[PDB]
Amino acid sequence: SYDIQAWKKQCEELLNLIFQCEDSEPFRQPVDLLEYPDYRDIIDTPMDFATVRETLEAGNYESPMELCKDVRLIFSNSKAYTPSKRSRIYSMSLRLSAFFEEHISSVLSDYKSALRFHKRN
Numbered sequence: 001s002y003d004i005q006a007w008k009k010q011c012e013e014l015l016n017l018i019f020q021c022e023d024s025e026p027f028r029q030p031v032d033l034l035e036y037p038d039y040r041d042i043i044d045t046p047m048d049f050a051t052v053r054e055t056l057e058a059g060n061y062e063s064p065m066e067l068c069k070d071v072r073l074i075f076s077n078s079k080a081y082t083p084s085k086r087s088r089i090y091s092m093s094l095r096l097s098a099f100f101e102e103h104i105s106s107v108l109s110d111y112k113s114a115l116r117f118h119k120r121n
């Protein structure tokens with residue numbers, strides 16, 4: 001299964017699944033900087049699922065590893081903003097992170113396999 005390009009539609013599909021999850025609600029759009037004026041000083045690099053989808057659709061990811069690094073930043077930014085590990089949003093972030101990691105594993109595996117096959121000879 002050595003299609004070097006197949007990751008992109010696989011990631012579009014997975015982002016669609018994540019937008020259908022009620023658990024993505026708090027991560028679907030950039031955090032409001034006027035609503036959270038201190039957000040700026042806790043979080044250096046904001047990240048949300050609309051930004052990831054638009055970066056993919058612009059052709060500005062070279063690999064699913066780069067998409068995966070931005071999705072992981074959403075979840076790390078939530079673990080950093082959370083004042084409690086028994087909070088609504090941080091709790092939503094941990095379930096969504098598990099769903100994402102369960103689905104991205106095969107995408108990364110298939111891509112890395114396809115690149116090794118391309119450089120086999």
Ligand SMILES: O=C(NCc1ccccc1)N1CCN(C(=O)c2ccco2)CC1
Nearest residue numbers: 025026031032077078081082083089090
């Ligand atoms: O307001 C946000 N995002 C816009 C939005 C949220 C809900 C509905 C529509 C739009 N947030 C998401 C990021 N964040 C946290 O991860 C977090 C951890 C502990 C408390 O919040 C702060 C809230």
